[model samples]
Target: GSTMAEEVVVVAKFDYVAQQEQELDIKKNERLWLLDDSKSWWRVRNSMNKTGFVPSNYVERKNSARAAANSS
Candidate 1:
């Protein structure tokens, strides 16, 4: 089975209202831990320990640490 990366960063293309407890108020930039891919929605975990559907465009794939280190 194919799987997605576990982490991502928020780009917040626009103001979004997450519909789940896991999905907290997304800001301009926040680290998100992915949980599910439901209905084309990116369900993720928040600092509050809830799962909510966050807009796909509202986030960006978090760069790998190796990549970050290499980029430096």
Candidate 2:
């Protein structure tokens, strides 16, 4: 299993959209695997182990108020 060190937040609400070259749908708030050196897209895994690509614009650094609270 791969671990994500950086936090990513979802900035906008997006439905499970179809990828340009895959058969999976990525929904909003879903944690995605960022490919090395890639900026235009992300590799996301669904609950069932299905993986696909999604646009990078839909996600942001996952820093919520809860995390901030924990930091202090």
Candidate 3:
């Protein structure tokens, strides 16, 4: 097996209301194991003992002012 795996820490807010696919959704600060050797959608586990696919960009604060700067 190739050893190119890396773990990435994610800071997210489940602002979109807690959904069932990933119960209790997420945490403000979490550790996600990057399951992809290629990248994109990431499979991660939550602190509440839940595992699911969380987008790599889910970490990106949605509709944030950073978007404002990018679109400005």
Candidate 4:
């Protein structure tokens, strides 16, 4: 769901189970950091310090900031 809001961070690790998706072993205390320049992409950090980019739709944020237009 595309919402006009700031990217939210994952408070806890949980399986990202969805249709046509593989089960993701997300660890606890991981941070879902949104790219400062991209609104639809997010950087996910696992418990082992592993990082990757996951689509915004696959994750949910605990606290979302107001959506703002990107300033180049």
Window of ten residues with lowest summed lDDT in model 3: 30-39
TM-score, prediction 1: 0.55
Residue 14, candidate 3: Cα error in Å is 5.6
Is 1 or 3 the stronger prediction by lDDT? 1
The best candidate in terms of lDDT: 1
Ranking by lDDT: 1, 2, 3, 4
- Candidate 4: lDDT over CA atoms? 0.47
Q: Estimate each model's TM-score.
A: 0.55, 0.47, 0.40, 0.38
How well does candidate 4 match the true structure in TM-score terms? 0.38
lDDT by residue (tens digit), candidate 1, 1-72: 546655454445455676665555676666666776656777777677765778788776565567447556
Colliding residue pairs in candidate 1? 22-50, 22-51, 23-52
Ranking according to TM-score, highest score first? 1, 2, 3, 4
Indicate the worst ten consecutive residues by lDDT in candidate 4: 17-26
The better candidate by TM-score, 1 or 2, is 1
CA lDDT, every model vs. true structure:
0.64, 0.53, 0.49, 0.47
lDDT of 2: 0.53
Model 2 C-alpha lDDT per residue in residues 1-72, reported as the tens digit of each score:
657643343333566566566734656666554432253566555567665566656655444577547556
**RMSD of every prediction:** 6.0, 5.2, 7.0, 9.8
| Count of backbone collisions in candidate 3 | 0
* Residue 42 lDDT (model 1): 74
Q: Any runs in candidate 2 off by more than 4 Å, and if so which?
A: 1-12, 29-39, 63-72
